[PDB]
Amino acid sequence: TRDQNGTWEMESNENFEGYMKALDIDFATRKIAVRLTQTLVIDQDGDNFKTKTTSTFRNWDVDFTVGVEFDEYTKSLDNRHVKALVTWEGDVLVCVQKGEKENRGWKKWIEGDKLYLELTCGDQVCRQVFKKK
Amino acid sequence: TRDQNGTWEMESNENFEGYMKALDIDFATRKIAVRLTQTLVIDQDGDNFKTKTTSTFRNWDVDFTVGVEFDEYTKSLDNRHVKALVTWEGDVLVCVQKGEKENRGWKKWIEGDKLYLELTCGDQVCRQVFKKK
């Protein structure tokens, strides 16, 4: 069939690095761009095509249990092994990531329809706020 | 509350740059990451957490009529001007992107639930498979 209408979700991506390298895309970009998943929306009328491609970063799924120290590989960030230990402090979820970096961890808690995530490394703190969908 | 279940959409991300620099994350990556809006999905069963983070990077539109040559500028990748021309070979949608790069194009076809995409540049070939969402 020639009917390619639809929303199409990437399930596999082989040798994207080689293709990008062939296009002279610089090394830094290829290391990033190779972490993207694609969604292809095609609106087709006969031989007339309108397409929209959205690229998304999908990080590695994590499974952890409160209290159980585990090895976390920080693939989305600095690609280090840390020994992560998450505990409850009241209703605040608290994590220390033991490893090369000092004072490294996070705190995560809910207030109303909002989730707060506080990330620390050294003397640097990042504060993220999320709303429930 | 200790219930952190849900799909959470980022509405702010203060000093992500400072945190990422403290982790020694390369500038190229930081420059992209600082602007991304994250979505956190959390599946929590008691003290067990399964989490995944995603974020949309970029959208690109490309529209065309099969058989009709068109100018393309490849902000997406290598930022080049090509003359693109699409045809049907059988039920395969075949595009050549005529320009400075040899053998540059793609081929796209449907089989059942799947869309197949083959991208070519020099001696390199990339293969992507999609599923109807």
Instruction: Transcribe A52-83 into DSSP letters.
Output: EEEEEEEPPPEEEETT--EEEE-TTTT--EEE
Query: Residue by residue, what is the 3-state secondary structure of A84-96?
Result: EEEEEECCEEEEE
Q: Which of B22, B26, B34 is nearest to A124 (CA)?
A: B22
Sequence length of chain A is 133
Phi, psi (deg, nearest 5) at residue B28: -55, -45
Q: Which of B54, B124, B128 sits opposite A12 (nearest CB)?
A: B128
Strand partners, B13: A128
Other C-beta atoms closer than 10 Å to the C-beta of B83 total: 12
Contact indicator for A104, A96 with CB cutoff of 8 Å: yes
Radius of gyration, alpha carbons of chain A: 21
Q: Which of A23, A131, A17, A52 is nearest to B127 (CA)?
A: A17
CA distances from A31 to A16, A25, B35, B110 (A): 10, 10, 18, 29
- C-alpha span between A104 and A3 (Å, rounded): 52
Phi, psi (deg, nearest 5) at residue A38: -110, 145
Other C-beta atoms closer than 10 Å to the C-beta of A76 total: 17
Tokens describing residue B70: 């068109």
Other C-beta atoms closer than 10 Å to the C-beta of A54 total: 16
Q: Which of A51, A55, A124 sits opposite B22 (nearest CB)?
A: A124
Give Cβ neighbours of residue A78 (< 8 Å, ≥ 6 apart). B23, B24, B25
Q: Which of B22, B52, B78 sits opposite A59 (nearest CB)?
A: B52
Per domain, the residue ranges of chain B are 1-133
State the best of B5, B11, B29 to mutate against chain A, taking most chain A CBs within 10 Å: B29
Q: Which of A4, A28, A129 sits opposite B108 (nearest CB)?
A: A4
Tell whether B67 is within 8 A of chain A (Cβ).
yes
Phi, psi (deg, nearest 5) at residue B20: -65, -35
Phi, psi (deg, nearest 5) at residue A125: -120, 130
Contacts of A101 in chain B (CB under 8 A): 22-23
Task: Give me the CATH topology for the region A1-133.
Answer: Lipocalin (2.40.128)
Are B12 and A66 in contact (CB < 8 Å)? no
- C-alpha span between B103 and B125 (Å, rounded): 10
Tell whether A32 is within 8 A of chain B (Cβ).
yes
Contact indicator for A118, A125 with CB cutoff of 8 Å: yes
Q: How many interchain CB pairs under 8 A, A with B?
A: 230
Burial readout B35-60 (b: 16 or more C-beta within 10 A, e: otherwise): ebebbbebebeeeebebebbbebeee
Look at strands B92-98 and A105-111 and give their pairing.
Answer: unpaired
Tokens describing residue A17: 């690095």
- C-alpha span between A132 and B60 (Å, rounded): 28
Tokens describing residue A94: 């608290």
Are A128 and B10 in contact (CB < 8 Å)? yes
Contact indicator for A16, B126 with CB cutoff of 8 Å: yes
Using CA atoms of B35, B37, B38, B39 in order, give the dihedral in degrees to the nearest 10: -170
DSSP string for chain B: -----EEEEEEEEETHHHHHHHTT--HHHHHHHTTPPEEEEEEEETTEEEEEEEEEEEEEEEEEETT--EEEE-TTTT--EEEEEEEEETTEEEEEEESSSTT-EEEEEEETTEEEEEEE-SS-EEEEEEEE-
Tell whether A75 is within 8 A of chain B (Cβ).
no
